[PDB]
Amino acid sequence: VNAVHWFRKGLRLHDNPALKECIQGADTIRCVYILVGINRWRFLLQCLEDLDANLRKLNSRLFVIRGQPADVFPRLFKEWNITKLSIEYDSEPFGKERDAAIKKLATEAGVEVIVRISHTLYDLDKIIELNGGQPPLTYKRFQTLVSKMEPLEMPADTITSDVIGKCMTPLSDDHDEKYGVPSLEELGFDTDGLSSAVWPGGETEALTRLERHLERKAWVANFERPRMNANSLLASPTGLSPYLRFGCLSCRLFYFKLTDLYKKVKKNSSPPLSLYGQLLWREFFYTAATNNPRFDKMEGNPICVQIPWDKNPEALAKWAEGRTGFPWIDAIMTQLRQEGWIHHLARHAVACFLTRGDLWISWEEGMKVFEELLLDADWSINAGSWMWLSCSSFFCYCPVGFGRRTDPNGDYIRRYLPVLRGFPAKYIYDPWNAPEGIQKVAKCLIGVNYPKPMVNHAEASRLNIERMKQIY
Amino acid sequence: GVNAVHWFRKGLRLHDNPALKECIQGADTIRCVYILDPWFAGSSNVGINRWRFLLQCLEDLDANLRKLNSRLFVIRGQPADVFPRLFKEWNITKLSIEYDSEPFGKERDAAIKKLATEAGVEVIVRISHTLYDLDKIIELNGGQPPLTYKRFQTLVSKMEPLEMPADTITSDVIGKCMTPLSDDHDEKYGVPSLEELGFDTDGLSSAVWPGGETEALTRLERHLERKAWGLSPYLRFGCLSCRLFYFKLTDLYKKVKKNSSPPLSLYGQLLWREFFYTAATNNPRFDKMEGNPICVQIPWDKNPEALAKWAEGRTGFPWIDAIMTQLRQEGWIHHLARHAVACFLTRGDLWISWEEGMKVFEELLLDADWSINAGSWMWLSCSSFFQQFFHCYCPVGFGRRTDPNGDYIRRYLPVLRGFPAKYIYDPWNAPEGIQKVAKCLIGVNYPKPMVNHAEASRLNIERMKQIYQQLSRYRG
Amino acid sequence: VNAVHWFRKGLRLHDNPALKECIQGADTIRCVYILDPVGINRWRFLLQCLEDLDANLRKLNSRLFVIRGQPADVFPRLFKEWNITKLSIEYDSEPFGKERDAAIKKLATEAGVEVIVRISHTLYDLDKIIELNGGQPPLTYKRFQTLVSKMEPLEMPADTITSDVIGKCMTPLSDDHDEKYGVPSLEELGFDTDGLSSAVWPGGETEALTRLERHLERKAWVANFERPRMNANSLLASPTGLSPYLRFGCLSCRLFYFKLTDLYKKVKKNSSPPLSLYGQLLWREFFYTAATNNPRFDKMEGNPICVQIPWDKNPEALAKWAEGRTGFPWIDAIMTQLRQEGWIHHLARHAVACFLTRGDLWISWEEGMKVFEELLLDADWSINAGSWMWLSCSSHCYCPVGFGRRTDPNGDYIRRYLPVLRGFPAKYIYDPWNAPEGIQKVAKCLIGVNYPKPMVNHAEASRLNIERMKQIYQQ
Ligand SMILES: CS(=O)(=O)N(Cc1ccco1)C[C@H](O)Cn1c2ccccc2c2ccccc21
Ligand SMILES: CS(=O)(=O)N(Cc1ccco1)C[C@H](O)Cn1c2ccccc2c2ccccc21
Numbered sequence A: 001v002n003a004v005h006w007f008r009k010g011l012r013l014h015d016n017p018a019l020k021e022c023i024q025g026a027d028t029i030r031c032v033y034i035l036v037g038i039n040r041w042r043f044l045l046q047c048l049e050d051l052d053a054n055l056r057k058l059n060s061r062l063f064v065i066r067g068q069p070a071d072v073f074p075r076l077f078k079e080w081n082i083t084k085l086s087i088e089y090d091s092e093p094f095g096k097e098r099d100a101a102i103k104k105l106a107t108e109a110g111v112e113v114i115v116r117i118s119h120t121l122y123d124l125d126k127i128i129e130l131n132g133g134q135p136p137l138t139y140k141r142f143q144t145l146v147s148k149m150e151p152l153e154m155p156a157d158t159i160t161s162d163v164i165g166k167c168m169t170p171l172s173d174d175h176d177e178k179y180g181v182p183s184l185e186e187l188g189f190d191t192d193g194l195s196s197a198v199w200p201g202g203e204t205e206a207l208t209r210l211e212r213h214l215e216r217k218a219w220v221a222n223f224e225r226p227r228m229n230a231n232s233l234l235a236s237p238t239g240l241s242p243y244l245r246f247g248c249l250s251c252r253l254f255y256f257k258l259t260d261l262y263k264k265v266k267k268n269s270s271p272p273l274s275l276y277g278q279l280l281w282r283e284f285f286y287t288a289a290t291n292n293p294r295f296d297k298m299e300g301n302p303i304c305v306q307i308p309w310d311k312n313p314e315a316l317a318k319w320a321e322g323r324t325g326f327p328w329i330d331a332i333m334t335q336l337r338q339e340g341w342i343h344h345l346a347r348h349a350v351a352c353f354l355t356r357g358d359l360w361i362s363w364e365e366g367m368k369v370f371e372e373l374l375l376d377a378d379w380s381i382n383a384g385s386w387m388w389l390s391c392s393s394f395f396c397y398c399p400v401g402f403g404r405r406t407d408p409n410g411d412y413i414r415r416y417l418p419v420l421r422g423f424p425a426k427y428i429y430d431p432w433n434a435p436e437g438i439q440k441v442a443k444c445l446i447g448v449n450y451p452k453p454m455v456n457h458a459e460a461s462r463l464n465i466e467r468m469k470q471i472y
Numbered sequence B: 001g002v003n004a005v006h007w008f009r010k011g012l013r014l015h016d017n018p019a020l021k022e023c024i025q026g027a028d029t030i031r032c033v034y035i036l037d038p039w040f041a042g043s044s045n046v047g048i049n050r051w052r053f054l055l056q057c058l059e060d061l062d063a064n065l066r067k068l069n070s071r072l073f074v075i076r077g078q079p080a081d082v083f084p085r086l087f088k089e090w091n092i093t094k095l096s097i098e099y100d101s102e103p104f105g106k107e108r109d110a111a112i113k114k115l116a117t118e119a120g121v122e123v124i125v126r127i128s129h130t131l132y133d134l135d136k137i138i139e140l141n142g143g144q145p146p147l148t149y150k151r152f153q154t155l156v157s158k159m160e161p162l163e164m165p166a167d168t169i170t171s172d173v174i175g176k177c178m179t180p181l182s183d184d185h186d187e188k189y190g191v192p193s194l195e196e197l198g199f200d201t202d203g204l205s206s207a208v209w210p211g212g213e214t215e216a217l218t219r220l221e222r223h224l225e226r227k228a229w230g231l232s233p234y235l236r237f238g239c240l241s242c243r244l245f246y247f248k249l250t251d252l253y254k255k256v257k258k259n260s261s262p263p264l265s266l267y268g269q270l271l272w273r274e275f276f277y278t279a280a281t282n283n284p285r286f287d288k289m290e291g292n293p294i295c296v297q298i299p300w301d302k303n304p305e306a307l308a309k310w311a312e313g314r315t316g317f318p319w320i321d322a323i324m325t326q327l328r329q330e331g332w333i334h335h336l337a338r339h340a341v342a343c344f345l346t347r348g349d350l351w352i353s354w355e356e357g358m359k360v361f362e363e364l365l366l367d368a369d370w371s372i373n374a375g376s377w378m379w380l381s382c383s384s385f386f387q388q389f390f391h392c393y394c395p396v397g398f399g400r401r402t403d404p405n406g407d408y409i410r411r412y413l414p415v416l417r418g419f420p421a422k423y424i425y426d427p428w429n430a431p432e433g434i435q436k437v438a439k440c441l442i443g444v445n446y447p448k449p450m451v452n453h454a455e456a457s458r459l460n461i462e463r464m465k466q467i468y469q470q471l472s473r474y475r476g
Numbered sequence C: 001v002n003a004v005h006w007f008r009k010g011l012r013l014h015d016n017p018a019l020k021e022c023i024q025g026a027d028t029i030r031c032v033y034i035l036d037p038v039g040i041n042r043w044r045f046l047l048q049c050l051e052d053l054d055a056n057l058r059k060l061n062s063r064l065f066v067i068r069g070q071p072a073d074v075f076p077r078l079f080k081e082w083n084i085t086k087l088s089i090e091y092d093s094e095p096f097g098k099e100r101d102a103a104i105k106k107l108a109t110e111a112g113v114e115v116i117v118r119i120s121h122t123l124y125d126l127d128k129i130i131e132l133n134g135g136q137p138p139l140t141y142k143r144f145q146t147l148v149s150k151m152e153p154l155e156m157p158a159d160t161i162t163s164d165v166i167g168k169c170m171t172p173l174s175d176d177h178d179e180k181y182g183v184p185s186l187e188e189l190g191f192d193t194d195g196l197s198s199a200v201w202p203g204g205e206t207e208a209l210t211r212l213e214r215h216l217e218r219k220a221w222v223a224n225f226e227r228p229r230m231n232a233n234s235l236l237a238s239p240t241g242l243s244p245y246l247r248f249g250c251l252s253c254r255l256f257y258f259k260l261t262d263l264y265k266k267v268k269k270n271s272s273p274p275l276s277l278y279g280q281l282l283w284r285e286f287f288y289t290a291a292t293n294n295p296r297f298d299k300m301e302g303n304p305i306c307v308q309i310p311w312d313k314n315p316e317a318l319a320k321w322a323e324g325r326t327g328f329p330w331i332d333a334i335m336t337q338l339r340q341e342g343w344i345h346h347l348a349r350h351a352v353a354c355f356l357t358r359g360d361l362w363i364s365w366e367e368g369m370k371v372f373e374e375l376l377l378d379a380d381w382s383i384n385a386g387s388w389m390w391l392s393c394s395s396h397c398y399c400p401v402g403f404g405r406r407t408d409p410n411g412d413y414i415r416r417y418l419p420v421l422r423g424f425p426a427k428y429i430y431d432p433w434n435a436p437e438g439i440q441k442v443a444k445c446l447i448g449v450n451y452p453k454p455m456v457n458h459a460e461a462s463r464l465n466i467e468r469m470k471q472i473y474q475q
């Protein structure tokens, strides 16, 4: 009995029911990964390095194979005498299609195919069945449906030496050269001058962050949402969203640990669904997207309102490169490109600026940039959020003033836009109003070193509010 | 020329605003301001429902001022710092306010009047938050507020007829008085959003209680229509004039009952509000037990765990937990529901200080102004204003009489929806098999009742009897 | 059965239940301290703690193993190299310690190692106090005392590790032990130790136990020692001071508690002492209880127990405060004693903390807490952050001139720690900028040259800061 587990998401040894089932009764086990901005690639490679290091602790290794799954697996079936193939289920339409092709190939070759749901809290198809064959398109209806779902089963036991037992991994002395985790440089990325990631990849990092997150949520929040402060825009050591997207952290483990901690602090009380809002919003979008192959499109998407967005390549590139001339917007887009995560409030600000608020550019162009740059931009959640914020499905931020109340000194701007550090707080959000003398001392002339504002926000927002009303 | 500022704090309305009307008279310019401190001393999100309501009151005020070719000025800061700069910057000669009877408000307004006088600025103050000039009620009573509602009603009966509402502010009232405006008004003086103020808005849905005068007047008309066959949030913020409410009630009675001498019970909600305001205005410790001269000193139990269970809707009594859940989620609960949970915390079941119930209500209740909140909690706990012993509300049986199926419980406590009506108010009595059918195990998914109500109420009734026997020996 | 006991705090052989359990049924025992190469005085105190442990372990035919590195890297190698089956630690309630220990516990589980954890840094299991309170820490000392009074009696101190306790258990040792596992020098940690004088606070369990006996002898001569007054201690370090030894674990708090009861029973001939007898230990326990579940206890933002105050960011003023260059001799003398010796009187802590925060400079208490963490020998994370929040009004304005003049009228304490000021008469030593030039000339200290001018006007600064605090407390 030769077992292979195929990692795609679920890049972890904890709560991996497909991997545990695959090892059961197996003589041999091999785990494979078969191989977007530089930050996303880097995070992925660090997840794989961490997987390899943790498999080494079990006297195993990760097998990274370059090629296409349809080509690689038939050769692997014969070469490794594979009797069992396991995957974590992928609900996303492109993933479902690819997995159906591999399942047929494996089944025809006499390979047992193990598929287990562990990327989401629930079986999304069962939610859709409870709703009469269509996904819920409102969060309240989704929550009503979740309330009627069966209590979630406990997380699978972590893959340990005891679980592996006598199952072994055949290895060669040339493993690193033939199956090693590639570097960014091997993939052709220019890494000259790249600094260390603000978001280290991998399950080990994810699990330490989960423990910190639970401790602050239970005792430092009384299980409530705390107020935002100046530093809330900066990457948190408790942030989990990239780890949930790549599968370094099980959403089911998070759910159980959160419930158990609530039960300890609130004796024998069951928590309100608001306690799981981040996980539930994530499920809602996965459920909405699973049967819609055009979820990320306007045309051909039955749930999306068709709106005549402008085509403006110059405006879009300015937005994407953080050259709008509004430092608050430009600072966010700069943090997005440099680090791969920005706060939800920051996402709303720049998405509104691009779509309904200022530039009137399609939400698809905003989604594609976020897809390249955001570590936690799962296809379903990214597309659904952009449609939601643009008033394109599911039924105005000032680009100058909004940030100042929580960040009056403009410390966030200064962190990410060094060209503006010379400006006093009076002008840091609106430097085009700084006198020439201030610009000269700051060594930043507006229109020269830093661009003038690309639009008049008051006039642009007014026209766009009118356009949205006329559409609706 | 004559530059006038009207300072909004309460009185968040253009109808029946005599201070604003007097301020416009003889003015070349008028600017309306609300002063908001953007600094938050706490990390908690718990007062979000009250903040959202206030912001909607301010947005509605700004939109109505916009119809008059004006704007609302929301100024960030503290009044003592802001007003001297505004006096010089805008060349202000007149400042108007609606009177604030609360002791902290009176102290603050005396300081601003001193600042205005030192700057050569005239201060206009008009009473319009209450039906009566509270000071005249107290003077009529010999210098002290009445301590019983019956005595208060006798005083009201000897008061002069209620003042008619002031004219609504319109183009005609404003006339040639103008508001200087700038293109940067929204950046410097716009109504902030909840997110701008630092609140996390993720768990918010549509408000059940939208703020603002426009909504208040609409709800007033509906309230009168139903009565022919709740406004307290709007009254607390001044979105609705209590004097207009009084006149509308008198008019409806004159139409329906064909008399001009209505019984005072017709205005009972307004008169109870007036009564607590009168008791509070001259008492700076009115919201305290210790040091409060009108408050009976009672040795209430100290129990932080029990108080937190009451506040968080984890008592194990579904009727109580449902009310406390609606209070947290929406910011308003019915008068009878307040009686029920207030009794359970204090005289009825837990014997916890009324100060603790007031603090939770202050955080959560949209209409919990300082005077009425403190007054109501002292009243129901038998700490002051004593006229009678109260009914001990049953945390199981009271709700079942009008809502036998427990639909209110099911709305707010989804964990209990599986239970049949036989056990919906007392799920601890459901057989283990029924709990399994309900998919809710008592002691696991939903807590057991935190007290035995029959034993707790019996002891607390005895405690109250001993207390009032001690009071009669004192009084003689 | 190969057992390792990991010292972090609890640097002692008396009342060490984790170590005692670890030896029970073990064929081999190794005691380790993990050091990754904090001001000089804390490092010096620590190394003396370790030298003391090593010498006492030598009496038991053992040695201390000092291992250079990070615990997460070091332990998996030690498990394999020494075939370790058992690892023991004294419980660390502090949030960072809890995270580190959970990480090592996972490593031990992967290696098949059983982890023994015993509570002995605190009087009580802090989690039990919190459960007795319904799941939240008490937020007042009065509430904390109510809870303590209803707890089961404090555990008795465990027996000291002696040869008979060790029994047939042995410590494998090599001739190169000192070369690989010896206690490091200050130079190895990179400190320049040239010019260092003797510590006023010698580290270690041996010093702590003798100081405990002397401390009990002294309280016996004090009227109403059941109601103790720490604020009546001298400004100079006490021969019987115990607070550094409690912080590092050289002295068991449970032993101290039992000896206080015993002294009360001997002197006051009753077994029912008031809890005030244990005030020093109980205040310490209260801050540990408040902090154990709050990972942001040492921060203002995101800390539910902390009032949010808009403190100034002023690095230069902070550096003057931290380095004792404020120009106020009382403040500067305290900060100089703190830097040179590692301990200052509780009222001296009040004085400088008020000056930094609400009183004069309006700098965050978090910045003051960090300097104390570097310099103060007894600044446990819990007590340090909790005290700094209290003193900054984050849960009376001291005069930086008059408070010290009343506490030390001749100004001899100032002269001791700021020798440049020794020439000034008492009339000016607390405010030497007011000394006439002729007096400054005779003193050989010109203000603005040999000693700085005062960095703020106390009268204007305190008046403004009191106003700001009122605006905050309006909410
Ligand atoms: C109002 S919301 O439902 O849109 N929303 C707010 C919220 C938080 C908790 C509850 O609600 C959730 C959003 O998904 C947050 N977010 C994303 C997340 C991942 C990937 C992309 C986006 C993205 C893009 C543009 C705007 C926002 C976005
Ligand atoms: C118009 S009103 O708001 O003044 N009011 C009239 C009235 C009648 C008797 C006393 O007050 C209606 C409210 O239901 C009265 N009420 C309570 C009742 C029981 C228990 C607590 C409260 C409580 C707390 C905070 C604010 C109000 C409160």
Ligand SMILES: CS(=O)(=O)N(Cc1ccco1)C[C@H](O)Cn1c2ccccc2c2ccccc21
Residues within 6 Å of the ligand: C280, C283, C284, C346, C347, C349, C350, C353, C372, C378, C379, C380, C383, C384, C387, C388, C390, C391
């Ligand atoms: C408000 S307090 O005075 O009651 N207090 C609480 C307390 C602790 C023990 C007994 O009491 C504080 C103390 O007095 C004195 N102290 C400390 C002591 C150890 C460690 C750090 C500090 C520290 C830091 C900054 C200001 C002062 C400080």
